[PDB]
From a paper:
DSBs can be repaired through the nonhomologous end-joining pathway (NHEJ), which processes and ligates DNA ends efficiently to prevent or minimize sequence loss. Polymerase λ (Polλ), one of the Family X polymerases, fills sequence gaps of [name] substrates with a strict specificity for a base-paired primer terminus. In addition, we present multiple crystal structures of Polλ in synapsis with varying biologically relevant [name] end configurations, revealing how key structural features and hydrogen bonding networks work in concert to stabilize these tenuous, potentially cytotoxic DNA lesions during NHEJ.
The electron density for the active site in molecule B was slightly clearer than for molecule A and was therefore used for structural analysis. The active site of this pre-catalytic complex contains the nonhydrolyzable [name] bound in the nascent base pair binding site, along with two metals (Na+ in metal A site, Mg2+ in metal B site). Superposition of the [name].A and SSB complexes reveals global comparability (RMSD of 0.63 Å over 286 Cα atoms), though distinct differences are observed. Surprisingly, the template strand is shifted slightly from its position in the SSB complex. The templating base in the nascent base pair binding site (K7) and its immediate downstream neighbor (K6) occupy a very similar position, while the template strand upstream of the break site is rotated approximately 3 Å outward from its canonical position on the palm subdomain. In the [name].A complex, the upstream template strand is rotated slightly outward from the palm subdomain and there is a concomitant shift of Loop1. Lys544 assumes an extended conformation and lies within hydrogen-bonding distance of the nonbridging phosphate oxygens between template nucleotides K6 and K7. The ‘thumb loop’ is often disordered in Polλ structures, but is ordered in both molecules within the asymmetric unit of the [name].A pre-catalytic quaternary complex and adopts the same conformation in each, which differs from that observed in other previously reported structures (PDB ID code 2PFO18, gray). Within the current lattice, the two ‘thumb loops’ are in close contact—mediated by a disulfide bond between the Cys543 sidechains—and interact with the DNA substrate. In the current study, the ‘thumb loop’ is ordered only in the [name].A complex and makes contacts only with DNA template strands from other molecules in the asymmetric unit.
Author numbering: 237 to 575
The structure:
DNA sequence: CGGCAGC
DNA sequence: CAGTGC
DNA sequence: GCCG
DNA sequence: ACTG
């Protein structure tokens, strides 16, 4: 089947092609930090296909039979399979490790990394001492090492509980759901994602700013990166937190507050994975629908030229299950969405 | 060849 | 608008 | 990078 | 989607 959102990610639990995917991931990451996002996307999808496959790939013909693998990818797969190496890795530009270093700063992407490299910068100390930094990038740089680590799941638990307890002190009826990789059951988490709503349809209002102010006053929030406080029905905070007590590190924290009617689509989005979401949204589009963090809708409205001019009509979805049902997809628990 | 999710 | 991110 |  |  061609659609990862129609398949359980536990197919990847035994990677029969580890020898191959480890090499391809180096090349994929090189393309990614150079800004070749669509080539890197094609690699990411081929790597998932190899991880998912039910046995070691043993021939070029078999490789080409797998959705997501074409002639070029099959050539590399078979070189690695039969020689143990991928010669193309030997020819990656010496700039790539530096571009990776620079784009590991939160708020600096490929264009900023390229610019710094062209200015002659090569190290994080060069950046700190000489580079022009946005407000977000200066936070990302000062927390560079803390943010590159994935935290143990146990620490993510303490963080999501800190947020939940602070929110429920304002209204005990709030639902506070840890999402992202935490909800998908992972043993380590790049950050903590928290979704908040209230089943009465109204009492989520106002909680966002009260909650951030409370967590700031206790010293739990240490830096803010992005705030969407007033635009529409959903509110979003991206920032930095730190648990109390000795030796604790700074961690990225994302919070979203949504009305109850959008809870299912916000939960589905924020649980991810990102590749799962992109697959499910592309599938919705082929079925004459549109899927976002706000709703599952009928197809967006377009004009004579093909240009989107307005939203489609919302289809009510009380639960995550309803989105899957309306798309004709087998339901997947969060841990099975880890694409 | 152009599109690759939707905010 | 370009860059960046979830 | 792959797909259609 | 915000940021600038
Ligand atoms: O490009 C994206 C990125 C994220 N998302 C959604 C799915 C993802 O699970 C969720 C949270 O984003 P994170 O960057 O926190 N990723 P995740 O929590 O899955 O993994 P990590 O352990 O790296 O945070 O937002 C997208 O839809 N598109
Ligand atoms: K497998
Ligand atoms: K194929
Ligand atoms: K990065
Ligand atoms: Mg996360
Ligand atoms: Na970055
Ligand atoms: Na996040």
């Amino acid at each position: 089947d061609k659609w990862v959102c129609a398949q359980p990610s536990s197919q990847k639990a035994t990677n029969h092609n580890l020898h191959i995917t480890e090499k391809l991931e180096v090349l994929a990451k090189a393309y990614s930090v150079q800004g070749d996002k669509w080539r890197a996307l094609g690699y990411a999808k081929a790597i998932n296909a190899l991880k998912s496959f039910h046995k070691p790939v043993t021939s070029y013909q078999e490789a080409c039979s797998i959705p997501g693998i074409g002639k070029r990818m099959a050539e590399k797969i078979i070189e690695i399979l039969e020689s143990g190496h991928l010669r193309k890795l030997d020819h990656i530009s010496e700039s790539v490790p530096v571009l990776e270093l620079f784009s590991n700063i939160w708020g600096a992407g490929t264009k900023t990394a390229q610019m710094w490299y062209q200015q002659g910068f090569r190290s994080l100390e060069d950046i700190r001492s000489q580079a022009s930094l946005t407000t977000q990038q200066a936070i990302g740089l000062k927390h560079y090492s803390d943010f590159l680590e994935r935290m143990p799941r146990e620490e993510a638990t303490e963080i999501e509980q800190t947020v939940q307890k602070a929110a429920q002190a304002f209204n005990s009826g709030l639902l506070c759901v840890a999402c992202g990789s935490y909800r998908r059951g992972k043993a380590t988490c790049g950050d903590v994602d928290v979704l908040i709503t209230h089943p009465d349809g109204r009492s989520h209002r106002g909680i966002f700013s009260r909650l951030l102010d409370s967590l700031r006053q206790e010293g739990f929030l240490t830096d803010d990166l992005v705030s969407q406080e007033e635009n529409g029905q959903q509110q979003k905070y991206l920032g930095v937190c730190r648990l109390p007590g000795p030796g604790r590190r700074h961690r990225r924290l994302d919070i979203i507050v949504v009305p109850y009617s959008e809870f299912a689509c916000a939960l589905l989005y924020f649980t991810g994975s990102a590749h799962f979401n992109r697959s499910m949204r592309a599938l919705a589009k082929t079925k004459g629908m549109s899927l976002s963090e706000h709703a599952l809708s009928t197809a967006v409205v377009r004009n004579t030229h093909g240009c989107k001019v307005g939203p489609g009509r919302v289809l009510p979805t009380p639960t995550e299950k309803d989105v899957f049902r309306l798309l004709g997809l087998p339901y997947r628990e969060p841990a099975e969405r880890d694409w």
